Recover the amino acids of this structure.
């Protein structure tokens, strides 16, 4: 409970006490994140987009509606979208008509999506043209999906990659992606071993794999990879099968479909738990930590020190480095209280500007990781930070192009 | 078919069937409008919005909220099918049980959000605590909203909700109005096509709207409202003390300003604005918005050797986050003129050609979209030239 409490306290998480139970956190029935949490999730999403889309020339972005055509025939559980008017129009405005009306709702009402797969399949022919039918290629999208709880509606941010490839290399690609995705979660982890995988198969015998994170109450699947075959793709283009073929060298084939879907929200919670260390400190990876640095003032002329801090902030923000402007506060807290709070907020570095600074331009820099302080000239702070971050980011990008198996 | 829309569909900035390329379809938001190049363009626009509105403003924090709100008016309601199947199972009809059902739905079912405002209001108290009750501050979010047509359209909204003392509300509204209009204009080829006007709602609250002059007429792409505190109070009935912020020595329920832009319509706006029958059409999207920054192709020579060079160059650029079109991957051959025409339609900033010559002295042919002039450059300098050029266009802000 210490982790969730700290997170709610420091605004990584949001919600009432009833909304902070493990069940409520996993249901997705309420917006789980506070500002610092939204920032962390945004950074995670960015890292996903860089590794899966930006750095892979065969992967394109796709966007699809949150709502899908109504059917009800299959008897699925997706929520239906019903116009309040139509309901009012039949009410205040027979018994056999009411039943007919209800029958209509079920059969014709649109529904909220449960996965991002269909959005990709629907845009497959378009991307086929974009790449001149050359296989393999993928469609990526990060978006919210809905799922029924217990009658509550849960919302989950899904990160999806749908990979179209000839059947003959489908097995190898599934293995390539499983390895690539596992290493992606681990490069940001304090305890990489807490991120694991397990192979599986579906009711139809199709192979796939799942990635898990070991939460205190057990392992939860944060990502799944499935080798779906061509069934769903074929069903998406009835009567046009002859024209949805891609090129596998000199051969034309209906591609096999690999679906890779990660849960960004659960993944964000995963890093929060993974970063918690005992002084309570959250050691989120430098690329994920919402706030990179904090600027505060020590003893000395208020207005002048604040001015120096303001210049430093502008310079950092201009470099895209997030900054917590602690010097703006009433600052009636001790140094120990300040550092303990920053440690809980996962602030990478805290800087202290004082009278001395006005004299020899030196500032005190405290590292969240080691908690060791040290002097440095205010003119070198930007360079140190920019470099420290690039180095962390470069280490994490070590194997982004490694050819697995 | 209209030239701009036709080019956009052909080059995958847009998606959809021909019927969905009419002005009404594109405005309704009743189909996913964008293709891969459009989705990239829109993402670049969203990034620039986040930079200006959130990254570069210490008083603005990110906020995330659900797509559905509690049970409004015309917003569609979310209904579990199981619950409907439960009643349809009953062998006994009874107009009493049925009517009571369609009644309970109309009163307990959640509904799809029409704006991001309420999500911001709901997260207000938490952020107030984060900033030690210091006013002013804002909560920002980019997300999709639903709007019943006349089918319910989906639109990506970029929202900033500003909490400030009423005494400074009008000053802040005017600041945001000017700031937002300039933001739209800085990326435009014809900034004068982005205009503004004052407005007021039914309650008499003052506001402003930004418009883009589409060929068929002006369309609102952003609205700014000085909402006062009505909605905030309605969000936190009872504990008024928990929502008061600090205005110096005073504790006050803040006035709320709503600044919302339509990122989808804005994407369509820049596409029309980029269109130039210059030389044959070309899309002159701002360098910060153009989805594809560079294209790589091979000239006459040893296929495998030339492609190998292109691969190394592509990996170098991608690692630097520069988007690259791997034309050299194509098996079908096309003339150079055909290539450049296509790249201009795709808004590609620079076009690079690796040839036999490149294999000897390492020099490549670099053609710019904007000037349409070709020039030789050593493959070892390309990466630096591009990273710099882009960083330079982005710095102009
Ligand atoms: Na890509
Ligand atoms: Na900010």
């Amino acid at each position: 409970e210490a982790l969730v409490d700290l997170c709610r306290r420091r605004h990584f998480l949001s919600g009432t006490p009833q909304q902070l139970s493990t069940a409520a956190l996993l249901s997705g029935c309420h917006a789980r994140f506070g500002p610092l949490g939204v920032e962390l999730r945004k950074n995670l999403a960015s890292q996903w987009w860089s590794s899966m889309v930006v750095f892979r020339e065969q992967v394109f972005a796709v966007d699809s509606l949150h709502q899908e055509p109504g059917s009800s025939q299959p008897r699925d559980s997706a929520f239906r979208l019903v116009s309040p008017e139509s309901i009012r129009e039949i009410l205040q405005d027979s018994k056999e008509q009411l039943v007919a009306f209800l029958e209509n709702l079920l059969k014709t009402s649109g529904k909220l999506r449960a996965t991002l797969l269909h959005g990709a399949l629907e845009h497959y022919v378009n991307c086929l043209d974009l790449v001149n039918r050359k296989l393999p290629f993928g469609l990526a999208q990060i978006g919210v999906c809905f799922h029924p709880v217990s009658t509550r509606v849960g919302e989950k941010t899904e990160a999806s990659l749908v990979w179209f490839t000839p059947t003959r290399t489908s097995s190898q690609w599934l293995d390539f992606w499983l390895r690539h995705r596992l290493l992606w979660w681990r490069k940001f982890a304090m305890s990489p071993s807490n991120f694991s995988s397990a192979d599986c198969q579906d009711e139809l015998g199709r192979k796939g794999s799942k990635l898990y994170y070991s939460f205190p109450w057990g392992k939860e699947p944060i990502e799944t990879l499935w080798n779906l075959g061509d069934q769903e793709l074929l069903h998406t283009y009835p009567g046009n099968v002859s024209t949805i073929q891609g090129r596998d060298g000199r051969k034309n084939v209906v591609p096999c479909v690999l679906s890779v879907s990660g849960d960004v929200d659960l993944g964000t919670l995963a890093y929060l738990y993974d970063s918690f260390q005992l002084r309570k400190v959250l050691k989120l990876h430098p690329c994920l930590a919402p706030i990179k640095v904090a600027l505060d003032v020590g003893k000395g002329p208020t207005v002048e020190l604040r001015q120096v801090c303001q210049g430093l902030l502008n310079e950092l923000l201009e470099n895209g480095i997030s900054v917590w402007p602690g010097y703006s506060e009433t600052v009636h807290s001790s140094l120990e209280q300040l550092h303990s709070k920053y440690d809980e907020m996962s602030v990478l570095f805290s800087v202290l500007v004082t009278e001395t600074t006005l004299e020899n331009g030196l500032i005190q820099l405290r590292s969240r990781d080691t908690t060791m302080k040290e002097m440095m000239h205010i003119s070198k702070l930007r360079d140190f930070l920019v470099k420290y971050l690039a180095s962390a980011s470069n280490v994490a990008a070590a194997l982004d192009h490694h050819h697995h198996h």
User: Anything to note?
Assistant: The first helix of chain A runs from residue 2 to 9. Chain A touches chain B through 80 residues (CB under 8 Å). The pocket of sodium ion (ligand 2) is lined by residues B 54, 57-58, 60 (CB under 6 Å).
